[PDB]
């Protein structure tokens with residue numbers, strides 16, 4: 093959680109890191125997405141891509157991103173420390189993030205938090221000794237009508253109870269991957285008592301088009 | 306080890322509104338004097354948008 | 369018309385909101401999307417701007433600025449720099465999840481809105497800044513953009529109109545403050561997401577220094593329907609200066625939390641009791657409602673009876689429409705804990721560039737934790753009010769106002785509850 097860096101033996105500028113050639117081609121596409129003279133605008137994706145190659149960002153991907161984009165490393169340090177997704181400390185294989193803002197707290201998300209804490213035997217911000225799960229607390233993740241909700245890696249698991257999140261953890265520990273969706277009856281965001289709107293079939297092309305167009 | 310002196314006019318500082326009053330007071334009392342002109346800052350040109358230029362070198366690397 | 373609500377399914381902007389139909393190009397084109405777009409692009413940017421501003425469409429981001437004037441701000445001859453349209457797909461405000469549904473189930477509507485807006489203001493390309501958490505939504509949006517590129521709808525000679533328009537998707541990195549337009553512009557440029565000072569406005573200097581117009585996903589996706597159906601049809605709904613339809617996300621202590629499209633001037637009680645199935649324990653169990661997400665203050669049960677869910681009626685009730693995110697709290701809720709959690713969210717999501725928010729929001733976080741615990745005195749309460757008056761209006765961006773408003777609303781509507789908590793703590797500890 094510290095915003096300063098100390099050279100540990102496992103995290104130092106001499107730690108080996110380098111992009112794979114397919115990641116290099118992805119980097120060239122990303123820097124081609126931007127106008128010339130503004131290559132630093134590709135600092136945000138490319139550095140994230142480095143995390144997508146490693147799972148965490150030591151200070152060797154920071155310097156490599158600064159080197160391949162011709163920017164000072166202090167700007168890359170600012171970008172990595174400002175945003176919350178960039179892991180400057182090695183997290184476990186499955187990064188569980190539980191939303192505990194007010195709309196999710198109103199639908200009993202703390203029960204999910206203590207259920208995960210009891211099942212995994214760890215606390216918030218701790219990692220399992222097998223380096224499999226990392227449990228932290230996040231803000232609103234944009235699925236407030238499906239509260240309570242967690243996010244594991246890139247996937248969203250919504251409308252959960254303690255039994256559902258225990259089943260999610262059991263499926264993750266067995267080596268499988270669950271379905272990233274709400275655990276209740278509804279599919280994405282419809283009311284649980286059936287479709288209160290959009291029951292009629294869509295009209296199609298040319299419906300209601302004004303004259304003179 | 307204190308600071309001893311033999312100059313009586315060491316702590317004398319006189320305040321004048323303009324330069325000509327100080328010159329007249331120095332010439333009246335018979336003191337040989339030197340005068341240096343007032344240095345005012347030149348008016349700068351400040352623009353907040355220059356930090357976000359499109360092709361100029363005045364872009365800020367960070368904010 | 370004086371009574372509003374009960375919108376028919378034929379008048380909905382966002383058909384296939386719940387993803388029940390195909391979201392790809394074949395499914396979107398069969399629902400009316402990408403239909404006669406060449407005529408829209410060839411009828412003229414001034415015609416598109418006139419059709420947009422005739423409908424009375426306001427900004428769906430939460431500010432409520434008239435989008436016709438805002439889009440016509442950059443309708444000026446070029447000076448060698450390119451012009452850019454930027455789509456705000458962050459949606460970090462609590463209670464708000466409508467743009468996720470728009471970019472997940474109707475991406476081609478967003479792409480067509482990008483093309484129509486870019487033709488309207490002569491923009492070179494579109495930069496859609498999606499949220500970092502929305503990985504699957506970003507992948508679906510990129511798939512739809514690739515499908516539009518392959519069919520010749522966007523890119524070089526877009527839809528056979530002689531206009532060249534590219535669409536780009538930039539993923540965020542998990543910052544709520546990057547949702548605001550100037551901080552979003554700085555985030556696209558590869559810097560810290562810290563807001564700029566206006567003036568200069570984004571229409572003068574925006575992304576890369578080029579002229580830029582930042583617009584919400586919802587206010588962009590409606591524009592092809594504005595151009596096709598006409599402005600008078602959109603202006604038929606809602607009250608005066610509150611025209612159109614709105615996506616409402618109802619959550620909190622309700623029977624069925626859901627996202628639903630409805631008219632602009634619907635009563636709040638009718639909307640909750642019709643689309644959400646009513647609050648838990650019946651309408652007598654309602655304690656408070658936050659109508660527009662965490663940036664807007666709450667209103668109590670007495671205000672909620674005869675309030676309309678548009679901009680003007682909520683401004684009259686000392687609140688705002690915001691993003692139309694209705695968070696409902698029943699009588700079994702520690703509302704002081706909810707407001708303290710909102711202030712803690714604002715403390716954790718704050719860019720920290722400028723002094724009043726950077727110190728004051730942490731100050732309210734500490735004093736609201738003390739208020740929740742009851743370890744305070746009543747004379748502090750008015751002092752906290754003064755602290756809010758030292759944050760609102762003295763900040764670079766509007767996160768300070770959006771953090772000061774919930775404290776003011778909580779104080780104004782529930783000062784006796786806080787005083788009762790403090791006197792109970794004083795009795796039980798002394």
Ligand SMILES: NC(=O)C1=CN([C@@H]2O[C@H](COP(=O)(O)OP(=O)(O)OC[C@H]3O[C@@H](n4cnc5c(N)ncnc54)[C@H](O)[C@@H]3O)[C@@H](O)[C@H]2O)C=CC1
Nearest residue numbers: 429430431433459460461547549569663688690691766770
């Ligand atoms: N949608 C969301 O996730 C959130 C929305 N909000 C809401 O958004 C609002 C605060 O955001 P802001 O962007 O600061 O709103 P507002 O102050 O800025 O202005 C909205 C737009 O109008 C433009 N504009 C206004 N006056 C102008 C002028 N004289 N000349 C040129 N352009 C002008 C601005 O550049 C901006 O693009 C509040 O209503 C708040 O409730 C707040 C938090 C989150």
Ligand SMILES: Cc1cc2nc3c(=O)[nH]c(=O)nc-3n(C[C@H](O)[C@H](O)[C@H](O)COP(=O)(O)O)c2cc1C
Nearest residue numbers: 427428429456458459460547548549583584766767
């Ligand atoms: C702290 C803060 C966060 C914001 N987040 C978003 C957001 O996530 N999505 C959005 O569309 N507008 C957001 N806004 C509002 C924008 O400043 C701006 O109003 C919006 O991008 C475009 O508004 P429009 O609908 O009138 O075009 C935010 C504003 C502030 C102050």
Ligand code: SF4
Nearest residue numbers: 719720721722725765
């Ligand atoms: S009000 Fe807060 S979030 Fe906004 S510019 Fe100031 S420090 Fe940043």
Ligand code: FES
Nearest residue numbers: 196232233235236
């Ligand atoms: S409050 Fe939890 S997802 Fe928004």
